[PDB]
Amino acid sequence: CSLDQTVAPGNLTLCGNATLFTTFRPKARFIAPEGWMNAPMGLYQRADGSIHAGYQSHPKHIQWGNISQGAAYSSDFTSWTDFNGSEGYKTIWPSQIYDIRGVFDGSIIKEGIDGYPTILYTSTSFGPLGATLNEAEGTETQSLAYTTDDGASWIKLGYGAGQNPVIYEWPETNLTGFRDPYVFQSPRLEALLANTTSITNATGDHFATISGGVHGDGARLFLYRQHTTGEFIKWTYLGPLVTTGYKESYGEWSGNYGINFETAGVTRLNPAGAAWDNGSDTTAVDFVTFGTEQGRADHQNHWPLWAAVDYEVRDNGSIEAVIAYSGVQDWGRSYAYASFPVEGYRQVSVGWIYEDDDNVILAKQFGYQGAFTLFRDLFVKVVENVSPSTPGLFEQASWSTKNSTDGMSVTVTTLGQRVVPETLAAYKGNSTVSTLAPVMLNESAAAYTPFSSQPTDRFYALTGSFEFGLNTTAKAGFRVLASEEEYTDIWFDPASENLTVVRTASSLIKSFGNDTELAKVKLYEIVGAESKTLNLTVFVDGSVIEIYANDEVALSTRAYPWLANSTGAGLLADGTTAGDVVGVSGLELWDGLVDAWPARPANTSQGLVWDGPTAAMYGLFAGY
Amino acid sequence: CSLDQTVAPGNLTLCGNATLFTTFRPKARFIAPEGWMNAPMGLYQRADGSIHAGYQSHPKHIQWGNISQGAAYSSDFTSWTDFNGSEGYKTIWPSQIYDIRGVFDGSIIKEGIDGYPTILYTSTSFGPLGATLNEAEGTETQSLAYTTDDGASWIKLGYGAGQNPVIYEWPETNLTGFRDPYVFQSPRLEALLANTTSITNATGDHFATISGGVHGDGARLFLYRQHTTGEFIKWTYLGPLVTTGYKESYGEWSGNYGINFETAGVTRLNPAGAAWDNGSDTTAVDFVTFGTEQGRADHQNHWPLWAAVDYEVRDNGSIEAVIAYSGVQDWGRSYAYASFPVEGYRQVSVGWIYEDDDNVILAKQFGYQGAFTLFRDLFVKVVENVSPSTPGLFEQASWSTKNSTDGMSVTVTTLGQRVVPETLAAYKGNSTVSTLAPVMLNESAAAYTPFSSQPTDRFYALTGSFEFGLNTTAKAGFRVLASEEEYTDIWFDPASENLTVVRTASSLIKSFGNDTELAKVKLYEIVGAESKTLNLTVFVDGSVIEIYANDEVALSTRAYPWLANSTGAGLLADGTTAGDVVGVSGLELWDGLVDAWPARPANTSQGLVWDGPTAAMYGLFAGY
Ligand SMILES: *[C@@H]1O[C@H](CO)[C@@H](O[C@@H]2O[C@H](CO)[C@@H](O[C@@H]3O[C@H](CO[C@H]4O[C@H](CO[C@H]5O[C@H](CO)[C@@H](O)[C@H](O)[C@@H]5O[C@H]5O[C@H](CO)[C@@H](O)[C@H](O)[C@@H]5O)[C@@H](O)[C@H](O[C@H]5O[C@H](CO)[C@@H](O)[C@H](O)[C@@H]5O)[C@@H]4O)[C@@H](O)[C@H](O[C@H]4O[C@H](CO)[C@@H](O)[C@H](O)[C@@H]4O[C@H]4O[C@H](CO)[C@@H](O)[C@H](O)[C@@H]4O)[C@@H]3O)[C@H](O)[C@H]2NC(C)=O)[C@H](O)[C@H]1NC(C)=O
Ligand SMILES: *[C@@H]1O[C@H](CO)[C@@H](O[C@@H]2O[C@H](CO)[C@@H](O[C@@H]3O[C@H](CO[C@H]4O[C@H](CO[C@H]5O[C@H](CO)[C@@H](O)[C@H](O)[C@@H]5O[C@H]5O[C@H](CO)[C@@H](O)[C@H](O)[C@@H]5O)[C@@H](O)[C@H](O[C@H]5O[C@H](CO)[C@@H](O)[C@H](O)[C@@H]5O)[C@@H]4O)[C@@H](O)[C@H](O[C@H]4O[C@H](CO)[C@@H](O)[C@H](O)[C@@H]4O[C@H]4O[C@H](CO)[C@@H](O)[C@H](O)[C@@H]4O)[C@@H]3O)[C@H](O)[C@H]2NC(C)=O)[C@H](O)[C@H]1NC(C)=O
Ligand SMILES: *[C@@H]1O[C@H](CO)[C@@H](O[C@@H]2O[C@H](CO)[C@@H](O[C@@H]3O[C@H](CO[C@H]4O[C@H](CO)[C@@H](O)[C@H](O[C@H]5O[C@H](CO)[C@@H](O)[C@H](O)[C@@H]5O)[C@@H]4O)[C@@H](O)[C@H](O[C@H]4O[C@H](CO)[C@@H](O)[C@H](O)[C@@H]4O)[C@@H]3O)[C@H](O)[C@H]2NC(C)=O)[C@H](O)[C@H]1NC(C)=O
Ligand SMILES: *[C@@H]1O[C@H](CO)[C@@H](O[C@@H]2O[C@H](CO)[C@@H](O[C@@H]3O[C@H](CO[C@H]4O[C@H](CO)[C@@H](O)[C@H](O[C@H]5O[C@H](CO)[C@@H](O)[C@H](O)[C@@H]5O)[C@@H]4O)[C@@H](O)[C@H](O[C@H]4O[C@H](CO)[C@@H](O)[C@H](O)[C@@H]4O)[C@@H]3O)[C@H](O)[C@H]2NC(C)=O)[C@H](O)[C@H]1NC(C)=O
Ligand SMILES: OC[C@H]1O[C@@](CO)(OC[C@H]2O[C@H](O[C@]3(CO)O[C@H](CO)[C@@H](O)[C@@H]3O)[C@H](O)[C@@H](O)[C@@H]2O)[C@@H](O)[C@@H]1O
Ligand SMILES: OC[C@H]1O[C@@](CO)(OC[C@H]2O[C@H](O[C@]3(CO)O[C@H](CO)[C@@H](O)[C@@H]3O)[C@H](O)[C@@H](O)[C@@H]2O)[C@@H](O)[C@@H]1O
Ligand SMILES: *[C@@H]1O[C@H](CO)[C@@H](O)[C@H](O)[C@H]1NC(C)=O
Ligand SMILES: *[C@@H]1O[C@H](CO)[C@@H](O)[C@H](O)[C@H]1NC(C)=O
Ligand SMILES: *[C@@H]1O[C@H](CO)[C@@H](O)[C@H](O)[C@H]1NC(C)=O
Ligand SMILES: *[C@@H]1O[C@H](CO)[C@@H](O)[C@H](O)[C@H]1NC(C)=O
Ligand SMILES: *[C@@H]1O[C@H](CO)[C@@H](O)[C@H](O)[C@H]1NC(C)=O
Ligand SMILES: *[C@@H]1O[C@H](CO)[C@@H](O)[C@H](O)[C@H]1NC(C)=O
Ligand SMILES: *[C@@H]1O[C@H](CO)[C@@H](O)[C@H](O)[C@H]1NC(C)=O
Ligand SMILES: *[C@@H]1O[C@H](CO)[C@@H](O)[C@H](O)[C@H]1NC(C)=O
Ligand SMILES: *[C@@H]1O[C@H](CO)[C@@H](O)[C@H](O)[C@H]1NC(C)=O
Ligand SMILES: *[C@@H]1O[C@H](CO)[C@@H](O)[C@H](O)[C@H]1NC(C)=O
């Protein structure tokens, strides 16, 4: 094992555990100190204003198992500090018959048991568990724990009748899944159900969804309501909130609803952020966010989706959320998006970016797997004065259209996503910022044109506005993590409406994924404009490439170039001519970003361990 | 629910939880503070000379589940004090994937991990578990924990490769069971194996047996040897130590070997007590004690047995224990005998006495189930100058015979058992003792003759020597827990050699067991004697009746009379005439015994709880 990054990579599978720990590792985002991580969980803003973030964690292993909550906190979403207690950075772990198989995803009741922050989480025990297996009742239940020390530790309620687990009965038979309880308050849903509370007797101020589905018959999001305000044991099943069909797809802009939902949440937004009205705000829109499984051929069979919904009240005192339009939260290698309320009428969403090493070839050499996305403000994106001649506009696939009275313009509404401003400010202010001169891409443009200032390492952001003619067939974008031999190309092709990440040359190491990422991006053309504009922001952070377009479209992916000098960046141009010209302005390079974990040394590995021969005997965890 | 014990019992199933807590409860013996208990475990003499006793425990329930070690200590086997920590009187409990289904029986390595007392115990996880089920590897494993505070708490080794569990591979396929590790030192076995240690490489000073069997093919006791002295992770399987056949019986004096062994131990004794020689002591005998299951129609299908064995060394460096003769440790409602070494060359044995309420009709009303037997010194019982005309003597069923050179007398050898003298001294000294005049039972004897002094409650001991003619057909014994309407009759019938406990009138409450208990007792006739003698000692302790004959035969049973005045006692006579006379001498009543738990109040119930609907979902524990 040579770690010489000035020459071609050898056989890296000969390298020891965690010898590649720092080589590809993100520095500017939320990531566990070491080992395996997946879904964000237990997210809440604490009483002091700081953010508590939990995550599914398996320390000292590089595959999933004994799944626990690791945790950390931040005052600005950006610079983090690990909790440190008797179990290191873990704060909840398998410990009881009801959760011994894993402490799965959960969410926070801010004023819960004895007034303390309280987590409702999926407690798992033994038996087949999975959407393609024959799971039985009891294998997944829902349990409570509360914290008296602001998340340093959690106390579970006792096991038994009238205690944990608090939700255990399956609401319908033959479930594909029964997990990821999302607890939320909703003046909207309270108003809608106020005339039906005699039917159900459920009058609490908290609702909870549980994500699942029914074998052979598609996904389900089940709605529960807290039975009585101030009491947390009794949750009353109302009915299915979202019901989709077996591998149903709403279309090309909407992924696929698969067979089973995971990590679903419910929110209400308006153009400024989170909306807490009862229905009276006509600018507010109800949204569900959810993962689906087994409706996709790649990306671990996983789509992270969202849908705008219209609530209808059923006669039995339950709610049907009818999908009005349906989109994708991120088009790349990310999943398990969670959202939570933040002071100042915000709803903030964050997900998990998995690696691109699905055959587990270099995982042990890394000594870790996974990171978060950036934290994103959600809001209702409104585009005014849209031209009716925008191609495909009236499909209304992942957006809605409202015509003006005279029919000459359209108002477009969709889900907006943008990186939280605290992170953008910290990134820019801690970086060496190069404001770049605008560039006209025409007949003279090379395929690749390096920026006049270059990054110094694998931690940088790029921004640019690409102005295209309305009938262009040119392509343009950004190349990143680039030397002569390795590079990753981010292209937008307005003619096809496809944003792609071409990764055929991303790395000389052949074991990593190299498939082309793809997102659909609708350039809403403005009345009177003779051009259309793509605003692209790209974060490069170790191996993470995270792309944002027009505060709407997100695509997270991975690139693992070996060579030390595969850090460059610049503009891409294809089919630009004297007549078909792409104007690039607002160009900026932010070199360095922020050290997100200032108290951590560069190498936080503690080595890896094997569970031994009993792992295969129990059959629950891989063991490493 | 009336608790009026001056009138007939009502419907006691209407009574609340623990309303009958003190009614039938032993006071003078080891018993949990409340709830369910079964097998003794973790027995050892601590560095200060006191005795640590653990037991299988399920607090606040009256059926088995979440099985844990409860613990207490004593300086004299007799007066006890509970441990009190964060889990009350528990000191080890299910907490890891490998033991979450129950912390089963274990035994003590006195100088173990870092020099501390260390327990090797059966750690259980999920799956079918039982001799009549299709158990698989991993469901029962063996794990270590050690104590730095003399048994107040235990620290388990970590889960994983080279740590817990330390024994997990099945030594043969299709096991009926794989549990109850018994760790012991043996100069005897070390001497026997010293020429074979090149074959196995196992040279440690500790051995361990694991109890089990093979489906369709009888019970097995598997022998392991510590691989290296001073190291406790690696245990090397040598081979089967004891192999018996599917429901094989050695005869009427020997119970039945069933299909599977439980709680087996290995010891070496001589006439004084424990023997620690290498083979050189010609008076010493090797013994195995073991429970068997499914070889008995009643008594929960359980025989607590023992066998004298002769060790043979196999060519592969293992030991075969060939059964020389085979007996019964207790003939009544007891099981799960454990033995442990005690200072002064002693080996002390104690078991579990279950209730006689197998349909669980009044268990909740009790608020507890189970107690220990008394603690018993084991030794080699030697009877000299036995007459060759003793009937059945040369069957050598649960004893051995050695003829004198001239053939006119025999030396008989068997397992001796007697109550530890610390308990006998404390019982007598704290009791009101009535020394009773001898009684000749002849033609004038009533069926029942009350003693001239009577007990004052349900806590007393009786002793007597019954002298019978060599060809008697008379029966005699003791009646206990007696009023006019309820009583329990203990008979010996020398003609049949049967000691019985007749319980048809033991209680007016009909739900309790009433079957007749039976033990075989061999009166070894002495050369020149014109009579034969049965020395009988009976302990009455709440509902426990514990009978000892000739420091050899033990029979533990239960009686639950309702009436407050069912406490009397006296002599029984049947078929005694002018010519067939039974002489009773050495008669003593000890009224009161000892309060074994002086710090406990009379009612130590903490109520009972239900596990809720998930108990049936998990399918592991009854839930109550
Ligand atoms: C199989 O058996 C298992 C073992 O018995 C069983 O698990 C046990 O279940 C019981 C009953 O449900 C649990 O008991 C509850 O404990 C809660 C507190 O839990 C937290 O604190 C525990 C003890 O605290 C100390 O001891 C530790 C060990 O030494 C130290 O680390 C601590 O520093 C602390 O020490 C201090 O106190 C010591 C004495 O206790 C003292 O010596 C010392 O000097 C020092 O001062 C921890 O053990 C526990 O940790 C476990 O659980 C957490 C998750 O919760 C895990 O992360 C850990 O790994 C570990 O497994 C916790 O940190 C109590 O609050 C709770 O009390 C109340 O509830 C009951 C019934 O509802 C009431 O009777 C009672 O009044 C209390 O209610 C009142 O208070 C609350 C608010 O205060 C209020 O809301 C309520 O209305 C009311 O007013 C109860 O005692 C026990 O924790 C479990 N143990 C373990 C190890 O798991 C298991 O379930 C069984 N399984 C089956 C299937 O049956
Ligand atoms: C799923 O995840 C699970 C959670 O992570 C995981 O379980 C955990 O496994 C790890 C690794 O095996 C265990 O860690 C070991 O812990 C041993 C000590 O255990 C005992 O003490 C623990 C911590 O002590 C404190 O904290 C408590 C909680 O607040 C308090 O109650 C105590 O008072 C005490 O507080 C003091 O210390 C605090 C900081 O620690 C401090 O803040 C505070 O102020 C105060 O001063 C207890 O948590 C633990 O209790 C658990 O386990 C017992 C049974 O053991 C149960 O009865 C309990 O209910 C509970 O579940 C124990 O009481 C360590 O000795 C051990 O250390 C060593 O071994 C490793 C590796 O071999 C070495 O790296 C290290 O150097 C140590 O070795 C050295 O020392 C020893 C002798 O000292 C020597 O022999 C050796 O050669 C060497 O020199 C290790 O850290 C952890 O306990 C597990 N936790 C739980 C909750 O279960 C689980 O396995 C996972 N499952 C799967 C399938 O993967
Ligand atoms: C006395 O001790 C017992 C513990 O043994 C305490 O708890 C009770 O235990 C018994 C088991 O011994 C439980 O009986 C079972 O009950 C279920 C159905 O229960 C439902 O209906 C009840 C009646 O109104 C109700 O009390 C229950 O409510 C509790 O549980 C729910 C969770 O489900 C919880 O939300 C509540 O807060 C309560 O905790 C519940 O809704 C029944 O299905 C069982 O049937 C089996 O057994 C019977 C009898 O052998 C048999 O007929 C059936 O065929 C089947 O095999 C079983 O009867 C009882 O529910 C427990 N009660 C509780 C928890 O309150 C009890 O509290 C102690 N008493 C006191 C005064 O302390
Ligand atoms: C680096 O990180 C790893 C953790 O990932 C550390 O532990 C090793 O993990 C790997 C899994 O990643 C283990 O590999 C498996 O090994 C078993 C067979 O193992 C036996 O033989 C080994 C070789 O000499 C020996 O080391 C083992 O000894 C350990 O375990 C026993 C308990 O069984 C214990 O008593 C000892 O004390 C040791 O702890 C053991 O006897 C093999 O069956 C597995 O095969 C599967 O996977 C492979 C590869 O994909 C595949 O080919 C097979 O078909 C099958 O699917 C697997 O290879 C390895 O045993 C672990 N080693 C340990 C515990 O020492 C490792 O230590 C870290 N290194 C450093 C330097 O820190
Ligand atoms: O990487 C997930 C691994 O967990 C396993 C164990 O069977 O399956 C469980 C479950 O995990 C994933 O679910 C989520 C969101 O992805 O993660 C947590 C569990 O950590 C759970 O609360 C969430 O729903 C996965 O998406 C599911 O499909 C899996 O069924 C492994 O099979 C799997 O590799
Ligand atoms: O009363 C025992 C109850 O435990 C259960 C659970 O399946 O079975 C396990 C096992 O228990 C008994 O085994 C012993 C000695 O009797 O007790 C401990 C477990 O507490 C174990 O280490 C000992 O071997 C019982 O004799 C076995 O037959 C059972 O298989 C219940 O089924 C059972 O009622
Ligand atoms: C990068 O490094 C490689 C090998 O070390 C070298 O061949 C190449 O010339 C360097 N520079 C660029 C821009 O590729
Ligand atoms: C990181 O630390 C681990 C554990 O100490 C060590 O095994 C590994 O070799 C280190 N890796 C690097 C790149 O320093
Ligand atoms: C309410 O009605 C819906 C639609 O039929 C149904 O799916 C749901 O199960 C009902 N709620 C109940 C039975 O609580
Ligand atoms: C919306 O506007 C377009 C173009 O003016 C027209 O084709 C369509 O019919 C309009 N829809 C409604 C509801 O008026
Ligand atoms: C650098 O980043 C830190 C951590 O997020 C932030 O608090 C600080 O304001 C930043 N510095 C700037 C913007 O100059
Ligand atoms: C074509 O592009 C080059 C490079 O941006 C620029 O120098 C030139 O002005 C452009 N041509 C026209 C006609 O604008
Ligand atoms: C654009 O994307 C779609 C997938 O939505 C794909 O079918 C099509 O081939 C792509 N076209 C081009 C030219 O990239
Ligand atoms: C015992 O009590 C019962 C009922 O209280 C009574 O009938 C009987 O006479 C009493 N005495 C005896 C010795 O049975
Ligand atoms: C014993 O205590 C328990 C729990 O407090 C109580 O329920 C029960 O009625 C008491 N029984 C007696 C006989 O005092
Ligand atoms: C017997 O053993 C084998 C594994 O050695 C296993 O496949 C089989 O299921 C076991 N049980 C029976 C009933 O054959």
Ligand SMILES: *[C@@H]1O[C@H](CO)[C@@H](O)[C@H](O)[C@H]1NC(C)=O
């Ligand atoms: C040693 O021989 C015995 C008798 O054949 C056998 O049962 C045992 O399994 C052998 N020991 C091994 C293979 O370790």
Ligand SMILES: *[C@@H]1O[C@H](CO)[C@@H](O)[C@H](O)[C@H]1NC(C)=O
């Ligand atoms: C033992 O003694 C009896 C009676 O003297 C006799 O029947 C038997 O043969 C003797 N056994 C031996 C081995 O001498």
Ligand SMILES: *[C@@H]1O[C@H](CO)[C@@H](O)[C@H](O)[C@H]1NC(C)=O
């Ligand atoms: C009474 O019993 C206690 C506890 O076992 C014992 O220590 C004491 O010696 C006894 N009293 C006597 C024999 O007088």
Ligand SMILES: *[C@@H]1O[C@H](CO)[C@@H](O)[C@H](O)[C@H]1NC(C)=O
């Ligand atoms: C018969 O028994 C009675 C009672 O023990 C006694 O008084 C009498 O002496 C006995 N008869 C003879 C002949 O010993």
Ligand SMILES: *[C@@H]1O[C@H](CO)[C@@H](O)[C@H](O)[C@H]1NC(C)=O
């Ligand atoms: C004595 O006990 C045996 C059981 O070993 C039994 O078969 C026999 O019937 C009993 N005989 C009498 C008279 O009690």
